[PDB]
Design a protein around this ligand. Structure first.
Ligand SMILES: NC(=O)c1ccc(-c2cc(-c3scc4c3OCCO4)cnc2N)cc1
Length: 286
């Protein structure tokens, strides 16, 4: 098959980056972009586009253009560093200071989403992108297909008498409003993987079921591997891998954790930030 005419009109398509995501060039600027192809569905796409249009944050990918045709085409910022996944697969591990730089950006991004009433719901190494091939770089969150936009139903229900209201609804009031905490769990797992080169929950060399490990919260701790890692880092992971969503660390609490009170790391991030902004900085009023 071929690409839609409206797309071909503005962009020159190119190689596959991930088998789907393609490299392409905007004709007007000769600049590199990334184009995500979603085969026809509608719903996930509708929300993803609507989310990407309204969000504006350095650690969240930006949408440049959209094409609704034989298939869906979403035009995004090209992230040259690729997926974080490819940096941690094959038991590869990142140096702790890099985990801190990356994770700090993940936390800001996800905090920003929660502030804006959005739950990602699919945080994984694959949906985290690096801006460059340098190991010191900006990261951006991607893939909002599974996202949720924020209990209004329950809220309406609590107005008025529960004369006819079922018990399980009232019981659900306790935990109502903590859906965002699933993102913090996911962050916890990502941080674990990054620090250790291996996953906290798997079926490899174990007879307890994946489900069971997770609900129990008994992650596979391998002291050999973790001796390399700080006690501060490990502590943060522990407060994110908390089974009770009400007790689990929020992004704010993670951001205040001692492991993240690291002025050098922050400085380096600011550095990479303004360096990215140089491209677009208009002179301003003194
Ligand atoms: N699942 C998604 O929504 C999504 C969106 C954008 C990207 C993305 C990937 C890349 C990649 S992947 C492997 C690469 C590469 O670029 C450098 C060469 O090697 C680049 N930009 C993107 N926006 C992935 C998934």
């Amino acid at each position: 098959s071929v690409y839609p005419k409206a797309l071909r009109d503005e962009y020159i398509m190119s190689k596959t980056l991930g088998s789907e995501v393609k490299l392409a060039f905007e004709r007007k600027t000769c600049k590199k972009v990334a184009i995500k192809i979603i085969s026809k569905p509608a719903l996930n796409v509708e929300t993803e586009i609507e989310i990407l249009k309204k969000l504006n944050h350095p650690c969240i990918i930006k949408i440049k253009n959209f094409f609704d045709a034989e298939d869906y085409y979403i035009v995004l910022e090209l992230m040259e560093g690729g997926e974080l996944f490819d940096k941690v697969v094959g038991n590869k591990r990142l140096k702790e200071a890099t985990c801190k730089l990356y994770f700090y950006q993940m936390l800001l991004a996800v905090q920003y989403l929660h502030e804006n009433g959005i739950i990602h719901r699919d945080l994984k190494p694959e949906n985290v992108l690096l801006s460059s091939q340098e190991e010191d770089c900006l990261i951006k969150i991607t893939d909002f297909g599974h996202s949720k936009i924020l209990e209004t139903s329950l809220m309406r229900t609590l107005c008025g008498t529960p004369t006819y209201l079922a018990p399980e609804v009232l019981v659900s009031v306790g935990t109502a409003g903590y859906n965002r905490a699933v993102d913090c769990w996911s962050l916890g797992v990502i941080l674990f993987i990054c620090l250790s080169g291996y996953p906290p929950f798997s079926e490899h060399r174990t007879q307890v079921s994946l489900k069971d490990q997770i609900t129990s919260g008994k992650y596979n701790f391998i002291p050999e591997v973790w001796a390399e890692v700080s006690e501060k880092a490990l502590d943060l992971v522990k407060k994110l891998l908390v089974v009770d969503p009400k007790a689990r660390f929020t992004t704010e609490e993670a951001l205040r954790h001692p492991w993240l009170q690291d002025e050098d790391m922050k400085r380096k991030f600011q550095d990479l930030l303004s360096e990215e902004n140089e491209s677009t900085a208009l002179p301003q009023v003194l």
